Symmetry: C3
Subunit: 163 residues, 3 copies
């Protein structure tokens, strides 16, 4: 509604994989639309980065080999503020939806939060590449920021909760 600022291993890798697939669909949908060049580029960058998160959590078995970097988290952070600055200031709570593209991005937002829940469970039973966790944490808010920008740029207001 706003910006929030072992089997456990295979489950984390799996959900991140799933999350990556929904980002793919959002990429394919956003592609058929001009004016989202940076976003589509950013999205593709997320898929490679998420691909890395999987490896860091499962495949990789040496910290020296961890691929995901801290800069990827910072990048996500700067886009959130940038997309927020862009989008009109929101004084209301948001509901998932609006343009088709914004909807797919919100879906990716919730699946990202799901992937994060799964990673939090993995980190509780063993040591992981903590960068991954923070990356997923920032990632969902990025999709929130993105979806709002996608609606505005499409001329469609965000769906708001009014009760």
């Amino acid at each position: 509604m706003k910006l929030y600022t072992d089997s456990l291993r295979v489950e984390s890798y799996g959900t991140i994989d799933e999350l990556n697939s929904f980002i793919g669909l959002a990429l394919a949908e956003l592609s058929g639309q001009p004016g989202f060049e940076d976003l589509t580029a950013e999205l593709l960058t997320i898929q490679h980065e998420l691909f890395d998160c999987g490896g860091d959590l499962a495949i990789v078995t040496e910290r020296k080999d961890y691929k995901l970097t801290e800069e990827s988290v910072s990048f996500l952070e700067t886009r959130i503020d940038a997309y927020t600055a862009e989008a009109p200031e929101l004084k209301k709570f948001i509901l998932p939806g609006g343009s088709k593209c914004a909807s797919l991005l919100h879906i990716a937002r919730t699946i990202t939060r799901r992937a994060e829940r799964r990673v939090v469970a993995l980190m509780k039973s063993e040591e992981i590449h903590e960068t991954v966790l923070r990356y997923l944490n920032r990632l969902s808010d990025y999709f929130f920021a993105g979806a709002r920008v996608v609606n505005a740029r499409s001329g469609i207001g965000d769906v708001e909760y009014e009760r």
Copy 2:
């Protein structure tokens, strides 16, 4: 704060999202003004559902929302041609999305169920979700009916 509660709020938000997509899609075709306004209301109620489960200290969801669903479930079940066999998820794109909403709703229900077992919750939420999956089943059928598409039945050919 507690996985079971957070897991339920998140699965409900996930559900709400897919509804957002189904609504975006449904809004592109005529003859679905009733379904459109409802999905929007459902999103608000789901918002309330989440909040009601997030509470750990009154509730927002009302028993009337559960009743409204049932009514619409009948109105739609009637409008649609009586079925005499098990139906498979699919048909038009809209109906396919509503069906997805149905399964995710079932998922959200399972999570709330597991939550309930560990602690007290606003039970109206567990009922709302239980009917919602049926509403989508009935909404998914109507959409195909309306679009003169037709529900995908379980026809051998394997």
Copy 3:
């Protein structure tokens, strides 16, 4: 102990729903009449899987995917690099169906621990995930879109008008 069984049914149901959506988008375009028919039988067999966990599904359906996989694999240009989910909207949906098929797999696998069940459902789901992978590729090939590849350096080359 009993919750693991319902979770497996719902997940399979959820998986079947995304498949219907994939089919809805895929059938909309010509040249994929083969997949359109295949995905169908898949939903029927997946409908059986649920029942088998509450036996209609046979080992014959499992071998069906086998052939389809290699066929599409041969048909699609042999990949020489890691690919990411995506491409055409159809490949994207089929790729989604893939990750979800694997999610249903984990649920059934969990059902194993609590109590052994028809060891056929797993076999199918296990191959179904591979099927969608290949299916997604052949779809991107026939559309001349080309699967998304894991290549960071190729990103800077993307249009950045705004």
